[PDB]
Structure 1
Amino acid sequence: ATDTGGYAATAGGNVTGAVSKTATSMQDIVNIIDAARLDANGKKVKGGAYPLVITYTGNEDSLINAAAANICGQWSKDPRGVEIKEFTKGITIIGANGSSANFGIWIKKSSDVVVQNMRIGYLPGGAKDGDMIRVDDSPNVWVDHNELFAANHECDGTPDNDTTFESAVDIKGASNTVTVSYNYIHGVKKVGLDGSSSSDTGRNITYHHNYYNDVNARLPLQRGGLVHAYNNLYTNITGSGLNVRQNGQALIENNWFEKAINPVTSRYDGKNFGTWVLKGNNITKPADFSTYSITWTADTKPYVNADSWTSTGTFPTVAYNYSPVSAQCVKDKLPGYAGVGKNLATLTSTAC
């Protein structure tokens, strides 16, 4: 169906007349998408000629393992990624169990795109936009059950001292409805944007059932819009978590936070603070901060931390249907449903 447990409502390429293809390499993916633009007469069709289900069977572990051993040699290399530009017929890129990629998926001005079961890590080209997954001007995109990783570390002398590795899931532009779920994101300094600038405000994004471990910041860095974060496991956040900016609104419910600095905040602009509605998280009052090693820091510009752990605004009625398990169940069970090789399994209260 089209139910993703979030704002995005798409079946991707799993629709009527979908054509299944197997890609054994990054280049196959590129070629497969190109072929999908031609009609029965060999002429290009705007938005694509037919829906696609690409099963990626390639494995780039040698590239990944080599990169892991020389972290600081990645940022200056050429970035690698498959671009899904202006393809609206519907497409799903799903990795076969055991597949791996040292390249990113860049979605631009497309719609109804699903990316699942992909293990992407240590991408080269952090200094030249080497994002793992990018959603730009693309509504109805579902990024589900992937493992996105690198090293939560910044090498010396990188451009802006911020380019050792690019982000895991960046959302910007008119990507009006997006769902980011069941991903195992670890060893990432900048997890992802939700708006590329002060002017790029908006969108309705849902982050659910993601397991974050050893990440520094941007979970996400929100600029306006609505963000619904539920059933996520946030551990070892070394910088800040959800940064709600430009009057954005967030509903933060039934998540488990632990060993996190500034888990919920609004900083870096000095104005137009966003709001949040907190409910059902493992933290319920400031007394719980010590229990779960939650630390807070100030910023040089005016900011707002959720150190009182109280709701600071409201949130409109959630459109879709979802059934969150308890925060405890997340902490107990989530690590077994999030990521690759889980056969796209979901956490239900029955499993709690």
Structure 2
Amino acid sequence: ATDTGGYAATAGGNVTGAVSKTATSMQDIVNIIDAARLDANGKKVKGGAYPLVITYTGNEDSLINAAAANICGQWSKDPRGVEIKEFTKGITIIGANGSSANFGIWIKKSSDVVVQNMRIGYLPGGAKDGDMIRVDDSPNVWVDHNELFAANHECDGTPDNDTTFESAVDIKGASNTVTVSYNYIHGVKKVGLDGSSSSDTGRNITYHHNYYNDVNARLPLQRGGLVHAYNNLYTNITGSGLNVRQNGQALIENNWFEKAINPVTSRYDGKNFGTWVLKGNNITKPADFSTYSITWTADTKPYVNADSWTSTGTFPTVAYNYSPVSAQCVKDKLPGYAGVGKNLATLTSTAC
């Protein structure tokens, strides 16, 4: 079974011949992956020698709590993260209930990677690429049921005044198919890119059943390609939501928006506006803006906001299978399915 409910179709390390290992710290993860590259004779095998299912049981609450207490002290620290580079055998990193991490997971030139049930927050190194989850040149990645958090705040005197904290889920390069689902993302200024530059366009990404609260921007900052966002709960968006750029196409269906500024827009380039297809959201017409506290602002450069709340383009036939519940049901039920400690539970219409 490789159904993620989105463009990524992967089972990760849960394939045949998979080796299960328990990691009790960031260092164990690093060592476990390194050992997974050696064959029976001790020789390195390209892409990995065998599939892995790493159960992380470590807990770095102390680090997280200390950081939460002094958020402006984080950006200048050394970044901390486990790099999953060129590992294609299939790998799943799943956190044990109660586990926690003050380090990120950086996926690079790999494929078939699943990251589940990890609580990652307040990472050091916002000024030196300290991302929580990064997907670079990596197709078939599934980021599901995690809690990614920090503080939605910018400290004074940080480089570019944009480095207090890095991103939650940045996706770039040839990460052609990715599914980001059931994540509880909160207190994050820059949620996640979809293309690192104007020239970094493409990919097919699905964002479904995520609960975003108190986030400033990039849900995602899309550059070209296709994005399918369904059954997400968007609350307290302080900057802008889905920013569809460089002629990207997005299908936005059955989501719940509330207390949001510029929830669907195309700005910051002044040209090559992307398009969106809107359907089944709690918002159906502009009259609803007042009901759900949706505010719109302009930009210094030419932009397009969805203030008419109408579809501005088309969207290709959605390849995979999925059954969205109603926008009301996500608002009612989603917070109990998204995040860690939910036993990877999913929201079916039955539970609605």
TM-score by length of 1: 1.00
Aligned to 2:79: 79
- For residues 22-63 of structure 1, the C-alpha deviation after alignment (integer angstroms, 9 at most, x for no partner) is 000000000000000000000000000000000000000000
Alignment partners' CA distance in 2, 1:232 and 1:305: 19
Alignment partners' CA distance in 2, 1:322 and 1:195: 25
Residue 11 of structure 1 deviates from its aligned partner by: 0.1
Residue 302 of structure 1 deviates from its aligned partner by: 0.1
Residue 242 of structure 1 deviates from its aligned partner by: 0.1
Residue 253 of structure 1 deviates from its aligned partner by: 0.1
Residue 137 of structure 1 deviates from its aligned partner by: 0.0
Alignment partners' CA distance in 2, 1:129 and 1:272: 28
Alignment partners' CA distance in 2, 1:125 and 1:221: 22
Q: Does 1:13 align with 2:3?
A: no
- For residues 44-101 of structure 1, the C-alpha deviation after alignment (integer angstroms, 9 at most, x for no partner) is 0000000000000000000000000000000000000000000000000000000000
Residue 282 of structure 1 deviates from its aligned partner by: 0.1
- For residues 284-315 of structure 1, the C-alpha deviation after alignment (integer angstroms, 9 at most, x for no partner) is 00000000000000000000000000000000
SS in 1 for 2:20: strand
Residue 218 of structure 1 deviates from its aligned partner by: 0.2
Alignment partners' CA distance in 2, 1:157 and 1:291: 38
- For residues 245-279 of structure 1, the C-alpha deviation after alignment (integer angstroms, 9 at most, x for no partner) is 00000000000000000000000000000000000
Alignment partners' CA distance in 2, 1:345 and 1:57: 20
Residue 239 of structure 1 deviates from its aligned partner by: 0.1
SS in 1 for 2:65: helix
Aligned to 2:101: 101
Alignment partners' CA distance in 2, 1:332 and 1:50: 42
Alignment partners' CA distance in 1, 2:280 and 2:57: 40
Alignment of 1:110-259 (within 5 A): 110-259=110-259
SS in 2 for 1:148: strand
Residue 230 of structure 1 deviates from its aligned partner by: 0.1
Aligned to 1:62: 62
Alignment partners' CA distance in 1, 2:287 and 2:321: 32
Alignment partners' CA distance in 2, 1:44 and 1:167: 33
Percentage identity across aligned positions?
100
Residue 121 of structure 1 deviates from its aligned partner by: 0.0
- For residues 140-179 of structure 1, the C-alpha deviation after alignment (integer angstroms, 9 at most, x for no partner) is 0000000000000000000000000000000000000000
Residue 280 of structure 1 deviates from its aligned partner by: 0.1
SS in 2 for 1:252: strand
Alignment partners' CA distance in 2, 1:216 and 1:47: 37
Alignment partners' CA distance in 1, 2:307 and 2:195: 25
Q: Does 1:49 align with 2:49?
A: yes
- How many equivalent residue pairs? 352
SS in 1 for 2:62: helix
SS in 2 for 1:16: coil
Alignment RMSD (CA, Å): 0.1
Residue 334 of structure 1 deviates from its aligned partner by: 0.0
Residue 192 of structure 1 deviates from its aligned partner by: 0.3
SS in 1 for 2:120: strand
User: Which runs of no fewer than 5 residues in structure 1 stay unpaired?
Assistant: none
- For residues 326-352 of structure 1, the C-alpha deviation after alignment (integer angstroms, 9 at most, x for no partner) is 000000000000000000000000000
Alignment of 1:270-281 (within 5 A): 270-281=270-281
Alignment partners' CA distance in 1, 2:151 and 2:34: 33
SS in 2 for 1:83: strand
Alignment partners' CA distance in 2, 1:310 and 1:235: 21
Alignment partners' CA distance in 2, 1:276 and 1:231: 16
Residue 216 of structure 1 deviates from its aligned partner by: 0.2
Alignment partners' CA distance in 1, 2:325 and 2:192: 25
Alignment partners' CA distance in 2, 1:309 and 1:246: 20
SS in 1 for 2:89: coil
Residue 181 of structure 1 deviates from its aligned partner by: 0.1
SS in 2 for 1:89: coil
Alignment partners' CA distance in 2, 1:342 and 1:237: 24
Runs of 4+ in 1 over 3 A off after TM superposition: none
- For residues 87-136 of structure 1, the C-alpha deviation after alignment (integer angstroms, 9 at most, x for no partner) is 00000000000000000000000000000000000000000000000000
Residue 221 of structure 1 deviates from its aligned partner by: 0.1
TM-score by length of 2: 1.00
Alignment partners' CA distance in 1, 2:67 and 2:220: 26
SS in 1 for 2:178: strand
SS in 1 for 2:345: coil
Alignment partners' CA distance in 2, 1:137 and 1:172: 6
